[PDB]
Symmetry: D2
Subunit: 352 residues, 4 copies
């Protein structure tokens, strides 16, 4: 697939909250470590593997207005590009809206366009060696390890957008026209009482992936609850890749992670019928509540293991995923996740 | 009611569209005349009575980005205030987000904050005589009458906001906190198959009024259909005051106005039951499809006459109102409006 | 004479000083009254007749930086123009360097270019009729008379520029090229020990006149002394037109004005020789030290009456002039002014 | 000596011209090589040893207005500091005037204040390895040697400021107050008909040195000539250090350098009388026109070898210097330089 913006994956995710001390604990429970402090702003860098999470507590700024609206949330998203000048000019030619971010003496002039819910989308062409943006804009803490391993999360795998009815098409067009993303798959998920629809959008770099979710015709489901609780469209869950989910599970549990309620025993009993010869240790999945899906087509096994945290920032939750030959998404996991969140809505008295 | 910003009424409404030549004919059909052109931008002043409508076709600006998103629409609103510097500074202390608008040589530096759907909310303290803002920022057309009467519309009476489920509270708070509006009345309107809920918000000047509308629990109605068609929250209808609605209705009709479908004969038959001694010429109302409402309490009659155009700007429609003692809104008129739009939904095949 | 920029006279002169309370007393001793205070800045409006003098005590601004360098001085100058947008854009196409001035809510965006010594040159197209720039940017003092008469000064007649050797040509070019001024007359003035050279530059409106002064080959004179005491090129004296100089002289005297030392009695004895039939009351001139000059060509008498204060603002001095048919300058008066300042040098010990 | 600004030497010098292709040849004759091109502006990097010379040909900027006024010249100067935030803040607290420079996406925000004649003075704290400003803001040419040796010029030694009469004190205070420079020496140089006065200011880092030059009482000399031809105050000559002047002379000669007329034979005949035991090969210096000075105090020899280029950019000339134990300036060399420029004045017909 052609890549006109020269997209080379996710660079960083940015966070903001109206209440001081609410994001720090979250990041620590998820295995992240504070590693540097911006040189003139009140913004901090948290890291795990190659994941860069930016904590922005800058007063009177884009981030502080965004957090007064949405609560604790993802307030920015940066993609890596080959050439920021070229990619920023191309996006303005194609109709994107520019966002100006102020900087101090000797800091970089990072370009950005408006994205989901007003959150900036940054186009960064300075990464990896020599000097990354963090080497120039930030000051590393005295003595800290600058590349912590944490609980094994490596890179950002994918993130979702929960959108109002009729806007799945709008956000598909945004990423199709500006970045040449493509609809890799379409889902129609039904729970016991409610349901949803989704389009899994993939970027041409084969790294950035963004599932776009919208409520069903019925209404009363989890997508509509998100939209009310977040006060608009936004990133509903962020997913981190790991090379070994059970091991990561054990490490997150030790430090305070809170996962979703596991599926019933029935689910684990039907795995072999559904995925003949998967090969995974059912005993270890079922003890942890891990979901298993993918295909088994004449010897060729492509699997997907997924597990979700409870909501931790307003309505936003996180996901720890391990791919074994499957580069897409799976309908059974999606359905399990969906039934889990629907039971919680009954539990809480908000549905039927 | 206390007025801490020193509000003094609406100053102007601003409109944009992505296709050139779509707004001119709508203004012309409502009785407005073009009277001036801005001195450096591609923006035009349309007037009737004391109503000032600004047509903004300035390329690569706030208004062009807003119209690419929403279609023909209301992209800006200005309020009259006693001292712009004090009101602007008090907004900014109470959390409002400032919006910067570029200006050329010798033009006014108009202050604004972000409002409904991102549309700027201006805070103007130079009006009336001596020089208004149109005297300084616009050049009147050679020989045109600078104060046209048109079809009789006088001032902007009110305008609505159609919001997403759960956001009526959000917008009520925005106006209560920054300007001290108050909820003057609550409505719960039910059609044949659908319904809505609304809060009529009143500013402390007794001039600015903004009903806030949201869809019912059942969904599928007209508010949800506006949100999808508009691509977000926005001003659903703008109402203009007239001192004589049957005369304004005849004027409007001559120059092409397209009004909604009238109520059935049954409605006009029940008027005397419901409003004993109203004193209005039923024969005139009924042939035009005008709606009559208010109260008849012990000889004190406080009436409201309303009529609505078809949708003219995407899903946005306009209202022509005459007040005869009633300063608020009427439930019976709200119902008939709602039932009429509901029947149109059924006719277009979008409802049940 | 063609007028491409639409010049229409002087609009205002701006002053600054590094010591608080040094300019106030000098304005009051020349007949000016404070009449308004800016709406957001620490800047005050001083007025007499149609002369507007702006006292700028704005901290951390162009004016504060300029006064730190030069001492009490003229830091700005504004010209009236027909259309600011056209004039400003023509200036920028002919190489003029733009100067941005910040402004608060609802204030005018005044365009300016760099002029003598970096002092901004404003281009104002809003004067007289309806609302001036003082009506929009300033708040008049409770109950003070908005148009005071003072001591009879009416308008700014002219103002000089003292320049470095070789820069008369440079400043003549600047005004010729941008506004089409012309060299109306050239002077070569010699004292007892020193001398100077000067180009009287005239604008195409018949109102703005700027004499440009430079030191002679000999050096050690009064222009060189100004340039060291002022710390650069700048406006050396500002002249105010009056319709009656002996009356203004009496008024100025009563409020504290200090005038230069008078010419010796010889001067007044030779007036008839030099200007047969001048017709002026020699007895009144001689008792006040007024200078008289011009021509007497076969009946046609074009006279000039001039008087100069002592230096009041570092090396800057002021002039009170009455024109009786002569629209230019006089060589005899220039010489007497020169000889008087030369004797002052000798008196202070700085010359020979 | 205390160093409050944390000064650590010169970082770069910047040049502009109104005529294209006038600076490229000058740099090439002086042994410099073009090594990179800015990533978004029309600015180019030239290098020799640790010397970085920036060629700024960016339209409608500070540089293009500065060049229209002064002709080919030094338009910018950058010092190295430990912390640009701290140094920039300290300089604004002490009265310096800020200068804003526009930058593109992912470029550094370089801070600067106003210096000699308006030319910016940059405060850069990013140098040496990791990434210098050139690694971030520029794009190295494909295949070129990034660190060329040229003719041996190592670093910038010093540079002068020619100032108007009475401004030696002004510029002395500027550097004393902001950066704590000190007057290391004072010269009073007389030629045959004219003379000058000078203060050698030294920075506390013992690297930055700036001799300040002003015309004598007599007038008509070479400083006054510079001021007219440059159209104001500015950098009259820039000096480059070399470890071997005779070998640098030979390589400069080869590629096109034009040196001043050497001193008469008489001057070399007297060297031994004035500097007993200097030890330098007089044959090699006299054939090349190199100037020799310093001291010979009981065995301890501190020498200075200097040679000057003809004027190459308007009235600006260059110096190639070798220090042999003398960290200051020499009065004989200054006098010989002065006599040489004076004779050229007589040759050209501008003096007596
Ligand atoms: C600076 C936008 Hg989170
Ligand atoms: C520029 C606001 Hg429609
Ligand atoms: C702000 C010009 Hg004196
Ligand atoms: C870009 C200033 Hg010479
Ligand atoms: Fe996911
Ligand atoms: Fe209405
Ligand atoms: Fe004068
Ligand atoms: Fe030198």
């Amino acid at each position: 697939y052609e890549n006109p913006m020269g997209l080379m994956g996710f660079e960083f995710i940015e966070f903001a909250s109206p209440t001081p001390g609410t994001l720090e604990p979250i990041f620590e429970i998820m295995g992240f470590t504070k590693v540097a402090t911006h040189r003139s702003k009140n913004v901090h860098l948290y890291r795990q593997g190659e994941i860069n999470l930016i904590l922005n507590n800058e007063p009177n700024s884009i981030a502080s207005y965004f957090a007064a609206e949405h609560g604790p949330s993802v307030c920015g998203m940066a993609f890596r590009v080959k050439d920021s000048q070229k990619a920023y000019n191309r996006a303005l030619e194609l109709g994107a809206q520019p966002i100006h971010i102020d900087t101090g003496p000797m800091e970089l002039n990072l370009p950005a366009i408006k994205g989901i819910g007003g959150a900036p989308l940054y186009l960064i062409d300075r990464f990896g060696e020599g000097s990354s943006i963090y080497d120039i804009d930030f000051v590393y803490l005295e003595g800290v390890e600058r590349n912590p391993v944490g609980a094994g999360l490596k890179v950002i795998d994918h993130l979702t957008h929960n959108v109002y009815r009729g806007r799945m098409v709008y956000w598909a067009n945004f990423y199709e026209k500006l970045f040449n993303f493509r609809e890799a798959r379409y889902f129609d998920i039904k729970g016991e009482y409610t349901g949803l629809t989704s389009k899994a959008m993939s970027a041409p770099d084969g790294m950035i992936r963004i599932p776009l979710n919208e409520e069903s015709s019925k209404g009363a489901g989890q997508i509509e609850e998100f939209l009310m609780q977040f006060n608009g469209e936004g990133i509903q869950h962020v997913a981190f890749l790991t090379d070994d989910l059970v091991k990561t599970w054990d490490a997150l549990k030790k430090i305070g992670m809170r996962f979703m309620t596991a599926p019933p025993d029935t689910y684990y009993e039907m795995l072999e019928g559904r995925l003949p010869d998967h090969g995974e240790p059912v005993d270890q999945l079922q003890a942890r509540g891990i979901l298993l899906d993918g295909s088994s087509v004449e010897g060729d096994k492509r699997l997907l293991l997924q597990i979700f945290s409870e909501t931790l920032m307003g309505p936003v939750f996180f996901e720890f995923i391990q791919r074994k030959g499957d580069d897409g998404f799976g309908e059974g996991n999606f359905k399990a996740l969906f039934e889990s969140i629907e039971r919680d809505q009954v539990r809480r008295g908000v549905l039927a």
